Each structure stands twice: as structure tokens, then as C-alpha cells.
Amino acid sequence: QPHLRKLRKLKRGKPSDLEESVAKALFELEASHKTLRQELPRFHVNTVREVKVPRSKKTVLVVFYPLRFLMLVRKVQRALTSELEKRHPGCLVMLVAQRQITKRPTDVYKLQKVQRSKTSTAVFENILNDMIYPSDVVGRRWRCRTDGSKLMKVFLDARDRKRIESRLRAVAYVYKQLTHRRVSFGFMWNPKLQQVSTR
């Protein structure tokens, strides 16, 4: 089927229900939508992963695409996620690029040769940027409580509050499911002066 071109060639044989639904939506958007028409033909996805957010409505459709399409996705990501979301009622769509992590070597000579973009720190912060893309991180803190825990809080610009606050809980859970790392979110109305917003 022509819509199966929006999947990696390995997945075209026996696509999943979520993958086929996303592929069909992408194929329709490549001609129906004005902005998406100029980018989607050169684009395809790897797989679609369903995430159930506890104590919340809807699910999260995590869509993995090759990292070579990062700039292509970032061009139309806000339009693309909005279109996929209206295609899938009761769902949230997150476009996450598939990134490879090289395990940290135990040798100082191998460590100097590690591609810094393949480190877990770089990959995890890039995945976080993927899931909140229209907004950007304006600050990052690590609260080290007396019991030994170290919780990371990420601050977003308070302007994007009306646009991302609903999905922040889903972003935090999907981030933990993908990176096995915890994240908390806050808002700064004056990121320059490090001024947090109360509400």
C-alpha cells in the first residue's frame, strides 16, 4: 500500500495497527496539508509506541523517526503533531528521534574518542527537547534532598504555559519510560532574572 512508504522498509511487511494508522495519516497529510506537503515525501517513521499515562486521560503516541530527519521534523513539528493528534482522538503525539547511546567506556583513551552527541547526557537532553520542541528549556536545577535523592527540575518560559501545561505530565512520564530518568517541570516568567512563576 502506498501509505506504507511512510514506514521503514523493515516494518512495511507486517505493520502494527498504530504504525499503519500513523502511516496512513502521514500519507494523507503529504498531499492535503499545504505546509506538510513540502516536507513529508522525504520523511518516514521507524515505529509507533503507545504509552499509558497513569491517573490521566488519553494515551501518548510516541513516534520514532530516523535522526537524519531531525531538521525536517523540526521545521513542521508543531503542525505535524497537531494534525496527528486530531487524526487520533484521545491521544497525544510526540515525535522523538531515535538516537544511539554509546555506553561510557572504562578506558581514558576510549573516552577521548566518544562522539559527544552519542553520550547519554546529550541524548537524554535531546529527547527532552524533542518532546517539548516549540518551547525551549530556560533553566535546569537539581534538588538534592537530604535523603540522597537528586531530582531534576526543568524550567520552561511562562509564555508557553497555556500551550504545554496540559501535556507536561505526559511528557514527564514518557521521559521516564524512555530514559529511565525522572524530570519535574516549572515555569519562569523572567528566565533572564531566574524568576519562577507561582501559577
Binding site: 535546569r140 536545577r141 537539581w142 537530604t146
Partner: protein
């Protein structure tokens, strides 16, 4: 030129504790500094501290309960065998009943009591009591 980040951090905390401040800002931060702070926090000599990211050597804000009499770094990091723990306790600690010597062992950064229980030596980083 700043030569030791850990010594700078421990000096700043000790000054704040002497003045009775509630919080102190540490700059620059490091992995060794955070590991040292977690050791002191584990034994209850400091409260919660927060690491602030600035895309450089970060900053740390440490909340201070007044339990820390003095903390300091030992430079250079002298090697310490498992038989040398008693020597260092005698030289730098106020008593055998309280106070800790912090070591850099191959098992990580830990206090001298923990390092002795793990039967591991290392390099002396500093002390607190």
C-alpha cells in the same frame, strides 16, 4: 588562578558556617564537590542543596544547619592505605568519636569509616566535623 575547586568550595562552606549563615553559594561546581556534599549530607552535617545549571561549571546553593563546625580539603591528595586510617584520624580529626575523613577510593568517594568497612584505600580528599 584557582587550582583546586574542591578546596575553594570547602573553604566557602567553612566561612559561611563560622559566620552562621543559613545558605551559601558555591562557584564553580564539580562532580567531586557534589560527591563531597552528598557525603556530608548523608551524615547530616548539611541540609538540602541545589545545583544550578548555567551551561558552564555550575553553581551550588547549600542550605546549612548549624551542625558543621569545620570542613576543609587536604592538598595534595595523599595516598592512604587501610592501615593509615588511624593516623589520619589522629592528625586531623578532633576526636575518635565524631568527624569524618573523606577518601577517593576506586569504589567511589566515601567517608573513612565506610572505606574501612569496605577494606579499601585511596586518596584523602578532605574532612568535616
Amino acid at each position: 588562578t584557582m587550582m583546586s575547586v574542591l578546596a575553594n568550595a570547602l573553604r566557602t562552606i567553612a566561612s559561611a558556617e563560622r559566620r552562621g549563615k543559613r545558605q551559601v553559594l558555591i562557584r564553580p561546581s564539580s562532580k567531586v564537590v557534589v560527591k563531597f556534599l552528598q557525603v556530608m549530607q548523608k551524615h547530616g552535617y548539611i541540609g538540602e542543596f541545589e545545583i544550578i545549571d548555567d551551561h558552564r561549571a555550575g553553581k551550588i546553593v547549600v542550605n546549612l544547619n548549624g551542625r558543621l563546625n569545620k570542613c576543609g580539603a587536604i592538598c595534595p591528595r595523599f595516598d592512604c592505605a587501610t592501615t593509615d586510617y588511624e593516623k589520619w584520624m589522629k592528625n586531623i580529626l578532633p576526636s575518635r568519636q565524631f568527624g569524618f575523613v573523606v577518601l577517593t577510593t576506586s569504589l567511589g568517594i566515601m567517608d573513612h569509616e565506610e572505606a574501612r568497612s569496605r577494606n579499601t584505600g585511596g586518596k584523602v580528599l578532605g574532612f568535616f566535623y
